[PDB]
Design a protein around this ligand. Sequence first.
Ligand code: 476
Ligand code: 476
Ligand code: IPE
Ligand code: IPE
Ligand code: CA
Ligand code: CA
Ligand code: CA
Ligand code: CA
Ligand code: CA
Ligand code: CA
Lengths: 362, 362
Amino acid sequence: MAHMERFQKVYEEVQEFLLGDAEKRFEMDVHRKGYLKSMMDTTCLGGKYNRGLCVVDVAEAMAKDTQMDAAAMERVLHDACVCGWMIEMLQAHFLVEDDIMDHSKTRRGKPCWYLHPGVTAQVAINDGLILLAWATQMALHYFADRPFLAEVLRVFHDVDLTTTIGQLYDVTSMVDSAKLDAKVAHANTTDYVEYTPFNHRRIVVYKTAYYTYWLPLVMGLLVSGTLEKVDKKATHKVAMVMGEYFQVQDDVMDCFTPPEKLGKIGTDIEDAKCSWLAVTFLTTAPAEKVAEFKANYGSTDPAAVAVIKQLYTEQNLLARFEEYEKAVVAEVEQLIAALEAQNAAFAASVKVLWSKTYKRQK
Amino acid sequence: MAHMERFQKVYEEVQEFLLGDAEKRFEMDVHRKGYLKSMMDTTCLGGKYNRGLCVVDVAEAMAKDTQMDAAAMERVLHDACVCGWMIEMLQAHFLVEDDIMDHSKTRRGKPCWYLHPGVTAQVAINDGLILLAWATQMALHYFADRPFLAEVLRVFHDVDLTTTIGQLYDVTSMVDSAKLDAKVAHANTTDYVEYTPFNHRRIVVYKTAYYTYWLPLVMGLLVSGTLEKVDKKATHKVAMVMGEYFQVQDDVMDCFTPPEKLGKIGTDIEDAKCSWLAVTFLTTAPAEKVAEFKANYGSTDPAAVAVIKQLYTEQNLLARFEEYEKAVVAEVEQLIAALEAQNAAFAASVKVLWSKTYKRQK
Ligand SMILES: CCCCc1ccc[n+](CC(P(=O)(O)O)P(=O)(O)O)c1
Ligand SMILES: CCCCc1ccc[n+](CC(P(=O)(O)O)P(=O)(O)O)c1
Ligand SMILES: C=C(C)CCOP(=O)(O)OP(=O)(O)O
Ligand SMILES: C=C(C)CCOP(=O)(O)OP(=O)(O)O
Ligand SMILES: [Ca+2]
Ligand SMILES: [Ca+2]
Ligand SMILES: [Ca+2]
Ligand SMILES: [Ca+2]
Ligand SMILES: [Ca+2]
Ligand SMILES: [Ca+2]
């Protein structure tokens, strides 16, 4: 990828800064510095970098569009890389915490951070908090003299909030909402009445679309000083459409993509998650198959999980996804075409992001 | 307390805003809104409000020392209350997450948030993240057009990082630092060689002093526009001394204050914490008593805990605290006197904070 080498160079730069700053400010000792280095490397590296690299792709596109000279271009690319790492560390934070919340086993082809024997969930929770803090530290340091610092902080923290609310929807989705009461436990649902297209859309847009699609695009515009050049509503709309689709893919892959290819072991079925598969099945399957689903879903029994997979297969869920995908392609293309009529350079950068999303395999 | 009524009024305002903003932005439903209200009330209320009220005390002191109209004074006080609630919500965040990490039972006289039956650790982790996000939301909304927004965000997030690093020191203080390795599980220390005055100070300064003493003072100065009228270095120093002392008090009370008076059940002894009591004992007790301490410390067995408490009593640790406290008083009064010679208005607000700290019983 065009910016991978530069992006990785900036990682090393940022890591040196952050660890050195802890030495300077907090009397950080050699052993804990090494621990934090290993923590950062394990939690921030090994993903696809779609979010971080998007910031750079957008920033470059807009820098070229606005005819920046050699020096201005170099600054924008470095700033874009720093913003990219802000999002990658936000991602790192989210995944650390989520892997604890989901009690998961693997991430990016390695054990989950909390499952490293010298870590445990009780230390890992705080390691996740360090990651989130570091993200803001990068902005405060690298963008101290940039008027765009304020807007970077605003969008970043708005998106942090958004994702945590999306997560709230996700973690509370398998209990009937009228029964959500801190003082009273309640079993997972038996009737699945709340497993609706509306509720699935709400979970995925807030937990995924804002930080995975909207944030990278906006940060790229902010660092290049070109936010005013594009249609705010249109940009938001296309980010939501792609982001929803991205999470749908993730949902489909939970069941149908081998864990060794995916790099993680999802447990959506045994955890009774309101996934795209569950919602699409429940709303389209004949009554006797819905009965079978309800009798098997949300069970850790490997055979019960297999029953659900079989039900999904026999209900042609993959074909139904293919049809959903065709509708998404059409809408995304319409939205990009409209963006292109306003600013072609930005529209092309959305196309780049879309191309890395459409029909991805992991 | 002079500003308690105003401070509580602002809580209700801020809560209405935050919950209303979730309805507007995230399609928040009535049930989860209710959940979030109960979460906010349980995690943010019921404490002493020393941090939040400090912001208002400082801001008022400094605003009175400037000549400003009734409208301007009202604005400073309201902004101060919002800043105070930022810190109280940061506190709320820290305690939610720490109670999970320490696997604790009670907080402010009620079950810990994660221990509420309808919550659990796997939901509460995210509830803590929402709290942290909300703190920044308050600044972004209430201070959208204030000159101090940028500096408020900078200090708040610097202190957030600081505290997470302090927490790192805390959670890893029971294992020999050379053995800290993510890949390898290691037993807690058996020799306690790193339970030193330096290492205790390092834990308490970063995990407590910055957010409990430094941050409230600085926020009060920022919202009143008076940060440049005070000695930065001297303000930092007095905050560190008082904060260290505050945490030492907390450590002492873990062992010696009834949990019903304290409002929480500490497990420092059971969890082999590098507390002030442990360090003071290990550095002052005769060799055979040190040996007996090592044999009994870090054990959940009631008899072993009882042995430690008796050893502490026999080593006169309470009396040793009183001597430490006398030394702290002497230093603080000297530092305050120096501050008073420079800015008497600010020095008075430091005295208010110190008076709530010195010889507190919970
Ligand atoms: C505030 C925490 C956000 C956590 C978050 C948001 C979106 C996706 N994930 C991780 C995925 P996965 O674990 O990567 O499959 P999910 O568990 O399916 O949602 C985590
Ligand atoms: C980043 C998490 C900070 C957690 C944090 C910082 C300072 C004090 N506490 C709580 C106290 P306590 O639980 O109130 O006694 P500690 O466990 O003694 O340290 C928690
Ligand atoms: C599905 C979501 C939103 C979490 C994982 O995101 P990615 O699939 O982008 O993970 P990495 O490339 O960062 O590993
Ligand atoms: C010891 C620390 C730093 C955690 C508890 O702080 P407080 O004793 O100030 O708790 P509340 O008043 O907020 O309950
Ligand atoms: Ca997960
Ligand atoms: Ca999850
Ligand atoms: Ca998933
Ligand atoms: Ca603790
Ligand atoms: Ca604790
Ligand atoms: Ca304590």
